[PDB]
Design an enzyme around this catalytic site. Sequence first.
Site, PDB file in Angstrom:
ATOM      1  N   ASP A 114       1.193  -1.310  -0.190  1.00 47.34           N
ATOM      2  CA  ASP A 114      -0.094   0.036  -0.107  1.00 47.34           C
ATOM      3  C   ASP A 114       1.152   1.316   0.565  1.00 47.34           C
ATOM      4  O   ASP A 114       0.463   1.894   0.672  1.00 47.34           O
ATOM      5  CB  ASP A 114      -1.146  -0.091   1.387  1.00 47.34           C
ATOM      6  N   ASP A 132       1.238   2.894   7.284  1.00 48.32           N
ATOM      7  CA  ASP A 132      -0.602   1.772   6.915  1.00 48.32           C
ATOM      8  C   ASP A 132       0.105   0.375   6.772  1.00 48.32           C
ATOM      9  O   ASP A 132       0.426   0.085   5.118  1.00 48.32           O
ATOM     10  CB  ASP A 132      -0.694   2.909   6.249  1.00 48.32           C
ATOM     11  N   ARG A 138      -0.063   9.505   0.653  1.00 46.94           N
ATOM     12  CA  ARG A 138      -0.893   9.392   1.461  1.00 46.94           C
ATOM     13  C   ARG A 138      -0.267   8.322   2.966  1.00 46.94           C
ATOM     14  O   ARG A 138      -0.184   8.777   4.392  1.00 46.94           O
ATOM     15  CB  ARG A 138      -2.704   9.241   1.975  1.00 46.94           C
ATOM     16  N   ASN A 139       0.573   7.269   2.584  1.00 49.44           N
ATOM     17  CA  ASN A 139       0.891   5.756   3.921  1.00 49.44           C
ATOM     18  C   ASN A 139       2.330   6.747   4.455  1.00 49.44           C
ATOM     19  O   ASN A 139       3.005   5.845   4.344  1.00 49.44           O
ATOM     20  CB  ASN A 139       0.983   5.128   3.162  1.00 49.44           C
TER      21      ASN A 139
HETATM   22  C1  LIG Z   1      -3.306  12.220   4.557  1.00 51.59           C
HETATM   23  C2  LIG Z   1      -3.490  10.840   5.631  1.00 51.59           C
HETATM   24  C3  LIG Z   1      -4.127  10.326   6.431  1.00 51.59           C
HETATM   25  O1  LIG Z   1      -5.232  10.908   7.012  1.00 51.59           O
HETATM   26  N1  LIG Z   1      -3.555   9.635   7.937  1.00 51.59           N
HETATM   27  C4  LIG Z   1      -5.005   9.206   8.216  1.00 51.59           C
HETATM   28  C5  LIG Z   1      -5.108   7.068   8.413  1.00 51.59           C
HETATM   29  C6  LIG Z   1      -3.092   7.449   8.165  1.00 51.59           C
HETATM   30  N2  LIG Z   1      -2.874   7.724   9.419  1.00 51.59           N
HETATM   31  C7  LIG Z   1      -2.088   8.922   9.948  1.00 51.59           C
HETATM   32  C8  LIG Z   1      -1.717   8.586  11.761  1.00 51.59           C
HETATM   33  C9  LIG Z   1      -0.479  10.042  12.064  1.00 51.59           C
HETATM   34  N3  LIG Z   1       0.034   8.962  12.769  1.00 51.59           N
HETATM   35  C10 LIG Z   1       1.657  10.086  13.863  1.00 51.59           C
HETATM   36  N4  LIG Z   1       1.021  11.665  13.712  1.00 51.59           N
HETATM   37  C11 LIG Z   1      -0.365  11.784  12.665  1.00 51.59           C
HETATM   38  C12 LIG Z   1      -0.313  13.364  12.704  1.00 51.59           C
HETATM   39  C13 LIG Z   1      -1.284  13.246  11.672  1.00 51.59           C
HETATM   40  O2  LIG Z   1      -1.790  15.005  12.249  1.00 51.59           O
HETATM   41  C14 LIG Z   1      -0.959  15.862  13.171  1.00 51.59           C
HETATM   42  C15 LIG Z   1      -2.539  13.021  11.673  1.00 51.59           C
HETATM   43  O3  LIG Z   1      -3.874  13.718  11.153  1.00 51.59           O
HETATM   44  C16 LIG Z   1      -4.254  12.807  10.119  1.00 51.59           C
HETATM   45  C17 LIG Z   1      -1.373  11.488  11.294  1.00 51.59           C
HETATM   46  C18 LIG Z   1      -0.804  10.920  11.849  1.00 51.59           C
HETATM   47  C19 LIG Z   1      -1.711   7.527  11.588  1.00 51.59           C
HETATM   48  C20 LIG Z   1      -2.084   6.362  12.804  1.00 51.59           C
HETATM   49  C21 LIG Z   1      -2.445   7.448  13.844  1.00 51.59           C
HETATM   50  C22 LIG Z   1      -2.059   6.173  14.939  1.00 51.59           C
HETATM   51  C23 LIG Z   1      -2.050   4.957  15.437  1.00 51.59           C
HETATM   52  C24 LIG Z   1      -1.798   4.416  13.608  1.00 51.59           C
HETATM   53  O4  LIG Z   1      -1.446   2.841  13.519  1.00 51.59           O
HETATM   54  C25 LIG Z   1      -1.551   1.697  13.796  1.00 51.59           C
HETATM   55  C26 LIG Z   1      -1.690   4.763  12.834  1.00 51.59           C
HETATM   56  N5  LIG Z   1      -2.780   6.364  10.347  1.00 51.59           N
HETATM   57  C27 LIG Z   1      -2.814   8.573   7.061  1.00 51.59           C
END
Ligand SMILES: *CCC(=O)N1CC[C@H](n2cc(-c3ncnc4cc(OC)c(OC)cc34)c(-c3cccc(OC)c3)n2)C1
Length: 311
Positions: free
Chosen positions: A141, A159, A145-146
């Site tokens: 994937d 992801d 975006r990832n």
């Molecule tokens: C554009 C990408 C998007 O919206 N995503 C949402 C799902 C994916 N994702 C992102 C995170 C994540 N991880 C860490 N820091 C982040 C900071 C952000 O903004 C300040 C943010 O905004 C949407 C996402 C962040 C995660 C994620 C978080 C916790 C646990 C986990 O997997 C176990 C993933 N997932 C990309």
Amino acid sequence: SGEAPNQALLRILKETEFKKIKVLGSGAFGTVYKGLWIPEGEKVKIPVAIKELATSPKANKEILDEAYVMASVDNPHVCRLLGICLTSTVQLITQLMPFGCLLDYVREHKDNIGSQYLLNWCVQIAKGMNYLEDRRLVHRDLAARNVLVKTPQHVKITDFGLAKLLGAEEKEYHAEGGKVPIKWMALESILHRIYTHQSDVWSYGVTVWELMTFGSKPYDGIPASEISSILEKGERLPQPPICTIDVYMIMVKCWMIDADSRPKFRELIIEFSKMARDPQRYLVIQGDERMHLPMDEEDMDDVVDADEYLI
Ligand SMILES: *CCC(=O)N1CC[C@H](n2cc(-c3ncnc4cc(OC)c(OC)cc34)c(-c3cccc(OC)c3)n2)C1
């Protein structure tokens, strides 16, 4: 023995150990929050991201599979799981990536991204993907975006919801069903549900194209149905305006039909590292010099630092 034991440690966090502070995102996955994790007995506060869901038996199984993969990875360009919290709704805890995803960062900062940043991100993504190859893990994937942004100078791959590990002799992964992101998939994956590290290279190519176009959607407007057809004829993504033929030639190589003819991630580190040593020679960006985001030997052309030369 067949394979090495995975002695990684899965840390379990008490709900009391961390404070949820704000909501970051809410989508197909569930709901991601910004928080702080204060490990009990320590004088430390850690900015973290928390993912929770809505309780389905197959949903928890998928979350725990992602947790297994994230807890086993340890690289500067790969997101690592800090822990899990086992409340009624299971929570995943990762390091906060303040700037969010790379796709939304390039779209938002389209008029302040210099060639030095673009090429540095290409090197960093190739380093994370090459580490994943070393660990016999196929991501399945890889897309802009990832990829998360810790700082504009440092990105990491995220992801692992689709990632499959391979057995010591198993070379391909034979998938059966599920929603798969068609515009990033290799031709073998679309036609035969086959996934290797070389099909990841194809998605790396599309990811690079997404960065070079500052967030353009691949094959925009064209549905998934005839995307397989377009690739069979010989059509690929167009050359991004800022790309010299050197950069685009690498993208096109990622998109070969013969997976074995595509470059290896260790080769992508070398090529993009050479380009990051003279960025304005490989990417032509309108006003490249005035942008800010918060030699002793004869021919220094093929000079590569040993930290980017991996075998
Ligand atoms: C554009 C990408 C998007 O919206 N995503 C949402 C799902 C994916 N994702 C992102 C995170 C994540 N991880 C860490 N820091 C982040 C900071 C952000 O903004 C300040 C943010 O905004 C949407 C996402 C962040 C995660 C994620 C978080 C916790 C646990 C986990 O997997 C176990 C993933 N997932 C990309």
